[PDB]
Amino acid sequence: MVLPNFKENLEKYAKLLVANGINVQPGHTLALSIDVEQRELAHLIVKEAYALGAHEVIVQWTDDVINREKFLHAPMERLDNVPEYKIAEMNYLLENKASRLGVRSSDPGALNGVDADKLSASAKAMGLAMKPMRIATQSNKVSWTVAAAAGLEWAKKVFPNAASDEEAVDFLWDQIFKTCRVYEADPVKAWEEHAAILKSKADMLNKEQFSALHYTAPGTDLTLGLPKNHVWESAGAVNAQGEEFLPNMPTEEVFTAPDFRRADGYVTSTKPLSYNGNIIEGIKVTFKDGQIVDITAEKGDQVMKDLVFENAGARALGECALVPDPSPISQSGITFFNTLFDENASNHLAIGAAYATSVVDGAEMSEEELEAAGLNRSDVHVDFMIGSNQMDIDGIREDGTRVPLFRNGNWAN
Amino acid sequence: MVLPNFKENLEKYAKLLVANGINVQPGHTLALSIDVEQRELAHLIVKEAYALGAHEVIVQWTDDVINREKFLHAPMERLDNVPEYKIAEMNYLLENKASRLGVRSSDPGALNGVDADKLSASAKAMGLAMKPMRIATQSNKVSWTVAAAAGLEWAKKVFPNAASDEEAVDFLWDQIFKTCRVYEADPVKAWEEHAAILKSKADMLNKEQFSALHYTAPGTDLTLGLPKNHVWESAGAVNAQGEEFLPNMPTEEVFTAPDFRRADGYVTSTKPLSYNGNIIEGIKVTFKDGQIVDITAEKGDQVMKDLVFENAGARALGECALVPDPSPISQSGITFFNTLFDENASNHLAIGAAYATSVVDGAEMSEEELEAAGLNRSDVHVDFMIGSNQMDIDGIREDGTRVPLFRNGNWAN
Ligand SMILES: [Zn+2]
Ligand SMILES: [Zn+2]
Ligand SMILES: [Zn+2]
Ligand SMILES: [Zn+2]
């Protein structure tokens, strides 16, 4: 009743993810990563990928229940290293220049109750093992896309007051479809014009080349430097083959990397965060000389401290992203407990790695150059959100001039 | 409605699969193959495996719709070889001595309009690539179990007289639960009673040590030599580590290997066969001096020839199994289009590999020794059903005496 024409819209969504998200070309290999619960969507994705000429789709199926049992019951020795066959699966994808479509539908609290040290050692072992792919991906060597599907446990958390499970799920798909423009009569046109409006804010920032940004809101007073020759990006990338693609659907942000060596001040998080299958609440961070010097959370405090102080590069920032508080996901009043959505509802920062493309010619830079360019290197990249309708930001020019950028959570003018 | 207490019985089934099918032990690795459509059962299986002390469950998810798309649309070079990463995965299972629980719920006609040459090439290359696994399982190096779950497309073919798709699946679940003794107050004891009965029979044929078997029925007059020191087996097996396990659930057969060098005459199949995701009908096979000299089918003729002429050892048999016509599955009158079910409703023969345990001490024999002893070495093993209410079978003794074994499809004297 809340979601009429479901099957048709779902097929319309699948088509979008494949034609416009990844942009499948003849001869391509597609890796789809997706939850078993979402087989219906997976079938539609795979059909469309072959209809557009893919030579091969490989589906890597995930499942929260089974992943939780592994974490809960396997010994550390199965959890703290990556077996060779998984590395060999990754290399086959790399070898084939596989596009990577990731459809997220997991329970935000999927791994609640798992020992802290196993989540942490598994994420470290994987972050190190999967690095070649992250590197290839963070530099648009292949098309990649992150998108969502309405998992049942996720939907119950997003809408705890739903009249029933089905209603919770309908409401989530409805948000997915609306933010991905699936209801538009011409979604491609609509995506093109959404893209244009963000691209023009990004161009305006690329021209200013601010030296730093200063954020202010209650619980927040933070100054972040920006690298020399940084690129603000949004909605739309071009891969190392001339092909256009959408890295995130939905998306409402314009973003770049700060200079990882320059951060002072403090910041209060305004959204929860799902990290390692746990929900983290009430995060606060203090920065000094470019480094995290204290990190705290009302729930999940130990998860954050372990993120930050036990992975290299994680005491520094790799992304700063702007989203107007009046934009549609922020305005829906929904908290998603999910990074792809909540990050497109609110300004956000990332702990850990900078995308290579956040600096000019960054996609052909070595790790050494990227680092010297002021772009943080890390095996983790963990977005947390800091915007609100009370937030002001100024851009700071090279001569210290303060330019209003955001006022009360929206572009200043 | 036609099915009592689904959730509880499904749970009881999964425990049964893990405890008595595979017999999971502390420290074991388990590999589960299961369709994504059966996630509810998979969650139950995985939970009990860890409850029983597994160190790791690795789930190999399978999906008919996506496999068909691949076969319909991928080019030959993605279908006629097995990527190194699948072989790495298999080797990781072998090195860890993984148990193998295969839950089948596949559509019998899953791959219906796929090019025959693609089916044949993909099966041949898999048969070659998976050889070290086939070998280890057929000589009980690890526990393994093949069992079933009620897939929708399968259930529709099985019960076209069903009021609905949902009721079709229900009737299939009811057969699965029925024949695996899930409805009994003590299924373990029911399974021990069942195994004890079939073991009586196999023990008695093992005393006989017939020289050959002679089958007669309307499309069948086939004589098959039996190896020196053959062993007739049924129900339970025992693995290299001393643990009891059940290879097949359900099961109703007693079986051994014929001598692959001794076969003469012709035989007609009596149930359809699902092979390479195609339904095969009206198979006739002609043997001369141990070898298939011609194989036809009214439907799927080419698929059968490709099986027999393209794979190593596929011109000889490696199994002959007996199941009385009045036995429960056969008596139900239902045609499953499914080997695990149909072969346990009817005498059958397997094209390809003999189990090492079909000759005394075969578990300990080199491949060379197995072949010297008269057990067929092959990269495939494919059962087809030949039994009916009119089949006669004589045992031939070493002094030339014909001893009735079956008359009109049943054990007889
Ligand atoms: Zn971002
Ligand atoms: Zn980010
Ligand atoms: Zn058999
Ligand atoms: Zn067999």
Side-chain angles (χ1 to χ4, degrees):
Chain A
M1 198 51 245
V2 23
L3 245 199
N5 315 120
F6 175 72
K7 273 184 175 222
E8 285 174 55
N9 283 324
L10 184 71
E11 173 175 38
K12 199 172 152 191
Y13 179 49
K15 206 136 286 191
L16 250 20
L17 289 169
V18 168
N20 308 276
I22 289 295
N23 192 8
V24 171
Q25 293 302 292
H28 267 17
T29 297
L30 202 227
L32 162 61
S33 154
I34 189 167
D35 190 287
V36 297
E37 169 183 5
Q38 301 299 330
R39 59 177 149 105
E40 182 183 359
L41 172 59
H43 288 172
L44 295 166
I45 292 163
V46 175
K47 289 181 176 280
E48 185 63 9
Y50 285 122
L52 289 170
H55 280 175
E56 190 187 4
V57 185
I58 292 136
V59 185
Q60 309 170 293
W61 292 104
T62 55
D63 180 274
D64 289 337
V65 170
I66 286 164
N67 195 52
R68 178 184 169 76
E69 290 294 319
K70 173 161 313 199
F71 271 97
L72 234 27
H73 307 293
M76 189 64 88
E77 313 90 79
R78 298 298 173 113
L79 289 175
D80 73 1
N81 61 277
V82 183
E84 271 301 322
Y85 74 88
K86 279 182 198 202
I87 286 165
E89 190 180 357
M90 169 201 79
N91 288 329
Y92 178 86
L93 296 187
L94 279 190
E95 186 69 7
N96 281 281
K97 311 280 281 149
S99 297
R100 302 292 257 121
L101 169 54
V103 172
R104 316 289 174 84
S105 67
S106 278
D107 185 350
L111 298 179
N112 198 249
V114 172
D115 297 342
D117 65 341
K118 294 163 163 168
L119 293 168
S120 188
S122 172
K124 189 160 188 166
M126 269 296 250
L128 200 194
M130 297 316 283
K131 170 150 66 174
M133 169 75 211
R134 261 199 326 271
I135 277 190
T137 217
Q138 276 174 349
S139 82
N140 312 332
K141 302 222 182 178
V142 310
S143 304
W144 52 283
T145 299
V146 175
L152 204 210
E153 286 309 317
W154 185 23
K156 280 152 55 163
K157 305 223 181 204
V158 174
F159 303 106
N161 264 51
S164 64
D165 288 4
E166 285 75 22
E167 196 200 43
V169 170
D170 285 350
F171 263 75
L172 215 210
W173 274 121
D174 183 56
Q175 293 292 330
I176 296 167
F177 292 162
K178 185 171 340 192
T179 67
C180 289
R181 301 174 179 97
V182 166
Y183 298 143
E184 302 288 313
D186 193 339
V188 181
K189 219 318 147 222
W191 265 100
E192 260 153 20
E193 286 195 72
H194 174 54
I197 296 183
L198 304 178
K199 255 90 155 72
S200 88
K201 284 301 186 296
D203 290 338
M204 171 283 291
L205 292 163
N206 283 337
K207 295 216 180 52
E208 299 280 25
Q209 290 292 311
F210 294 117
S211 170
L213 298 174
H214 179 211
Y215 302 78
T216 290
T220 294
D221 184 341
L222 177 70
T223 294
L224 294 194
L226 294 182
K228 231 89 263 295
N229 297 318
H230 55 263
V231 194
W232 282 90
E233 297 187 285
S234 67
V238 186
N239 67 12
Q241 300 114 72
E243 297 156 357
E244 314 226 276
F245 73 97
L246 297 166
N248 286 352
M249 316 182 209
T251 198
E252 304 281 319
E253 57 173 310
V254 294
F255 67 91
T256 190
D259 176 349
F260 82 103
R261 290 184 252 249
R262 302 201 275 137
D264 294 288
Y266 55 89
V267 59
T268 297
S269 189
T270 51
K271 300 280 185 182
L273 161 71
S274 175
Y275 170 75
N276 275 344
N278 295 251
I279 294 177
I280 299 141
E281 282 181 299
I283 291 163
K284 304 182 314 187
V285 202
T286 302
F287 284 86
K288 183 159 219 299
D289 292 318
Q291 312 281 58
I292 301 174
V293 127
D294 185 43
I295 186 163
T296 261
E298 299 152 6
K299 279 184 61 228
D301 179 293
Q302 96 164 281
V303 164
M304 281 331 280
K305 276 174 170 75
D306 276 13
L307 165 54
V308 166
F309 298 107
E310 281 148 34
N311 305 69
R315 277 151 24 78
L317 296 174
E319 192 190 340
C320 53
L322 300 181
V323 179
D325 190 79
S327 58
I329 303 182
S330 170
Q331 284 308 297
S332 77
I334 299 161
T335 296
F336 291 83
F337 299 88
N338 158 272
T339 301
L340 168 71
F341 278 71
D342 283 330
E343 89 187 336
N344 280 303
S346 180
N347 299 328
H348 61 266
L349 298 167
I351 298 163
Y355 316 114
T357 47
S358 294
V359 69
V360 176
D361 294 338
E364 11 276 294
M365 276 188 193
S366 52
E367 291 292 280
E368 290 91 287
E369 308 166 312
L370 282 163
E371 189 164 356
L375 262 61
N376 198 45
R377 322 315 299 151
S378 186
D379 290 351
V380 302
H381 176 100
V382 172
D383 302 280
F384 70 92
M385 276 64 69
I386 73 181
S388 68
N389 55 196
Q390 315 266 256
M391 169 158 285
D392 289 352
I393 306 174
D394 297 337
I396 297 169
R397 302 196 185 287
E398 197 61 42
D399 69 344
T401 319
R402 304 285 153 137
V403 178
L405 230 190
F406 259 41
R407 285 294 177 272
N408 293 316
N410 188 21
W411 301 106
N413 282 62
Chain B
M1 195 61 46
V2 290
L3 219 208
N5 297 133
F6 176 57
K7 295 290 152 75
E8 291 76 24
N9 281 313
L10 193 66
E11 180 168 328
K12 263 177 80 178
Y13 183 53
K15 296 176 179 204
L16 207 37
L17 284 189
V18 178
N20 309 273
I22 289 300
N23 195 9
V24 164
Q25 296 294 312
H28 278 176
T29 299
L30 164 73
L32 201 209
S33 311
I34 187 153
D35 191 290
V36 301
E37 173 184 349
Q38 303 301 141
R39 86 170 106 104
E40 182 179 8
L41 177 61
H43 297 163
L44 300 169
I45 288 165
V46 177
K47 281 178 186 302
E48 195 55 27
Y50 288 112
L52 286 178
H55 274 8
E56 196 177 11
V57 191
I58 284 143
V59 185
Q60 293 195 214
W61 293 102
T62 226
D63 176 280
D64 288 335
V65 162
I66 282 139
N67 189 46
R68 181 184 169 75
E69 291 292 317
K70 173 184 203 189
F71 270 100
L72 288 177
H73 306 292
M76 185 69 72
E77 320 84 59
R78 302 298 173 119
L79 299 167
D80 75 3
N81 62 271
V82 179
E84 295 173 19
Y85 77 88
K86 297 264 153 52
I87 291 164
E89 177 171 57
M90 168 195 80
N91 281 327
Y92 171 93
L93 295 182
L94 283 182
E95 263 157 292
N96 285 276
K97 299 167 188 322
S99 301
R100 305 301 307 272
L101 173 58
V103 181
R104 320 272 157 92
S105 56
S106 194
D107 175 4
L111 288 186
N112 177 48
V114 172
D115 294 344
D117 59 358
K118 282 169 183 163
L119 297 178
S120 174
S122 170
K124 184 190 157 168
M126 277 287 298
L128 290 161
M130 296 312 282
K131 199 179 181 178
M133 185 68 296
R134 300 287 134 83
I135 280 157
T137 261
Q138 308 198 97
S139 53
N140 304 342
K141 289 290 140 69
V142 302
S143 299
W144 53 284
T145 299
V146 175
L152 169 67
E153 290 301 324
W154 178 20
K156 290 155 56 176
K157 279 155 173 84
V158 182
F159 296 102
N161 50 159
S164 43
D165 278 13
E166 294 64 32
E167 176 186 80
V169 159
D170 289 344
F171 284 123
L172 224 195
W173 277 122
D174 191 42
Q175 290 307 125
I176 299 177
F177 295 159
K178 190 161 335 222
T179 58
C180 300
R181 288 162 187 103
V182 170
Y183 296 134
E184 308 283 340
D186 198 329
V188 174
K189 271 59 179 178
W191 270 101
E192 303 167 338
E193 158 181 10
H194 187 57
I197 298 174
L198 300 188
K199 183 169 122 78
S200 285
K201 204 100 217 196
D203 288 356
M204 173 292 259
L205 296 155
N206 279 343
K207 276 164 201 126
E208 297 266 21
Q209 292 299 124
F210 292 117
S211 295
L213 294 180
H214 180 218
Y215 302 73
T216 279
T220 295
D221 180 348
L222 178 66
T223 295
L224 288 185
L226 299 184
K228 295 293 167 162
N229 320 307
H230 46 271
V231 191
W232 288 90
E233 290 168 297
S234 52
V238 182
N239 64 198
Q241 292 76 216
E243 296 137 2
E244 314 206 321
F245 71 93
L246 300 161
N248 278 9
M249 294 174 68
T251 201
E252 310 278 332
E253 47 171 305
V254 304
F255 62 95
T256 193
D259 186 325
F260 82 83
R261 277 181 183 103
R262 293 179 275 156
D264 191 75
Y266 52 91
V267 55
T268 304
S269 73
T270 229
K271 302 273 182 171
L273 169 67
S274 175
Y275 173 66
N276 261 338
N278 287 33
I279 286 152
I280 322 286
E281 303 175 73
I283 300 172
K284 190 173 124 195
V285 196
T286 299
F287 292 86
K288 210 170 307 137
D289 303 322
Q291 284 228 125
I292 292 175
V293 121
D294 196 24
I295 179 173
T296 51
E298 300 175 336
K299 296 166 192 297
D301 195 278
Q302 190 57 47
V303 166
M304 288 322 283
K305 287 173 166 58
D306 293 349
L307 164 56
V308 165
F309 303 102
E310 302 316 319
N311 300 87
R315 299 227 266 151
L317 299 173
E319 188 192 335
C320 43
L322 304 177
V323 171
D325 197 70
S327 58
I329 302 189
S330 168
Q331 224 268 283
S332 81
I334 293 162
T335 297
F336 296 79
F337 305 85
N338 168 281
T339 293
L340 174 61
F341 274 70
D342 285 341
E343 85 191 338
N344 282 298
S346 181
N347 302 331
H348 55 265
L349 301 169
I351 296 168
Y355 297 91
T357 47
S358 299
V359 71
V360 174
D361 298 329
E364 318 286 334
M365 291 183 185
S366 84
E367 289 297 296
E368 213 188 296
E369 285 174 324
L370 283 170
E371 190 171 7
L375 306 212
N376 202 39
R377 297 301 77 201
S378 186
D379 290 329
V380 303
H381 173 103
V382 174
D383 307 288
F384 64 98
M385 281 46 82
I386 64 164
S388 70
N389 66 354
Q390 309 182 25
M391 184 154 100
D392 298 339
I393 309 175
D394 288 338
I396 297 193
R397 306 191 153 132
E398 71 171 5
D399 69 17
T401 304
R402 318 296 159 122
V403 183
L405 288 173
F406 266 41
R407 285 290 174 278
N408 308 314
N410 193 194
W411 291 110
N413 66 1

